[PDB]
Design a protein around this motif. Structure first.
Motif, PDB file in Angstrom:
ATOM      1  N   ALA A  85       0.637   4.321  -2.560  1.00  0.00           N
ATOM      2  CA  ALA A  85       0.423   5.685  -2.111  1.00  0.00           C
ATOM      3  C   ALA A  85       1.461   6.621  -2.704  1.00  0.00           C
ATOM      4  O   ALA A  85       1.161   7.780  -3.026  1.00  0.00           O
ATOM      5  CB  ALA A  85       0.495   5.746  -0.585  1.00  0.00           C
ATOM      6  N   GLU A  86       2.702   6.156  -2.798  1.00  0.00           N
ATOM      7  CA  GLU A  86       3.761   6.975  -3.364  1.00  0.00           C
ATOM      8  C   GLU A  86       3.454   7.320  -4.814  1.00  0.00           C
ATOM      9  O   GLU A  86       3.587   8.468  -5.246  1.00  0.00           O
ATOM     10  CB  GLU A  86       5.075   6.223  -3.267  1.00  0.00           C
TER      11      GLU A  86
ATOM     12  N   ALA B  50       0.416   7.243  -6.139  1.00  0.00           N
ATOM     13  CA  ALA B  50      -0.799   8.045  -6.131  1.00  0.00           C
ATOM     14  C   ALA B  50      -0.482   9.515  -5.907  1.00  0.00           C
ATOM     15  O   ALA B  50      -1.105  10.399  -6.519  1.00  0.00           O
ATOM     16  CB  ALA B  50      -1.765   7.558  -5.058  1.00  0.00           C
ATOM     17  N   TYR B  51       0.486   9.804  -5.037  1.00  0.00           N
ATOM     18  CA  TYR B  51       0.901  11.186  -4.818  1.00  0.00           C
ATOM     19  C   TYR B  51       1.428  11.793  -6.107  1.00  0.00           C
ATOM     20  O   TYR B  51       1.124  12.948  -6.436  1.00  0.00           O
ATOM     21  CB  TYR B  51       1.967  11.229  -3.708  1.00  0.00           C
TER      22      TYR B  51
ATOM     23  N   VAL C   6       0.822  -1.207   0.000  1.00  0.00           N
ATOM     24  CA  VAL C   6       0.000   0.000   0.000  1.00  0.00           C
ATOM     25  C   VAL C   6       0.855   1.256   0.000  1.00  0.00           C
ATOM     26  O   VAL C   6       0.471   2.272  -0.594  1.00  0.00           O
ATOM     27  CB  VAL C   6      -1.078   0.021   1.100  1.00  0.00           C
ATOM     28  N   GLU C   7       2.027   1.225   0.637  1.00  0.00           N
ATOM     29  CA  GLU C   7       2.927   2.375   0.616  1.00  0.00           C
ATOM     30  C   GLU C   7       3.424   2.633  -0.799  1.00  0.00           C
ATOM     31  O   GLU C   7       3.513   3.790  -1.229  1.00  0.00           O
ATOM     32  CB  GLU C   7       4.133   2.060   1.510  1.00  0.00           C
TER      33      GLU C   7
END
Lengths: 66, 65
Positions: free
Chosen positions: A8-9, A11-12, A4-5
């Motif tokens: 998220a990276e 996605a940013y 998930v990290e």
């Protein structure tokens, strides 16, 4: 970092492309990478969170194409 | 239900650049023991400059607890 990290990276970075009005092909390239990665991660470690991350990426791309 | 709400609100906060809301949502996921949501939200908060890598590790540990 776990799955998930990593998502998220990316996605940013995707949010940056959208906010800076990057070309749609660039938005789609990264959104599709996220979608495929989230689908694979969901099969390995199913969670509501991964389903929602996948949907967030699909929704962002759908809105970007309009 | 509530996991999905927290994750979607964190995505919105990340898109708006609202570091305080990101940290508030992170704190919610941590207290509720949502590990995946904590990790995802903590990484958005880290990329937004709202938390540090050491804080991220502490939040993840607390969520797992």
């Amino acid at each position: 970092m776990g799955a998930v990290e990593r998502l998220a990276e990316k996605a940013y970075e995707l949010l940056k492309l959208v906010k800076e009005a990057a070309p749609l092909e660039e938005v789609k390239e990264l959104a599709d990478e996220i979608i495929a990665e989230a689908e694979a991660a969901l099969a390995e470690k199913p969670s509501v969170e991964l389903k929602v991350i996948l949907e967030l990426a699909k929704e962002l791309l759908e809105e970007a194409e309009k | 239900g509530e996991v999905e709400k927290i994750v979607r609100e964190a995505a919105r906060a990340a898109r708006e650049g609202d570091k305080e809301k990101l940290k508030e949502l992170l704190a919610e996921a941590v207290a509720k023991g949502y590990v995946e949501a904590t990790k995802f939200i903590a990484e958005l908060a880290l990329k937004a400059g709202a938390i540090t890598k050491e804080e991220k590790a502490k939040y993840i540990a607390k969520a797992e607890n």
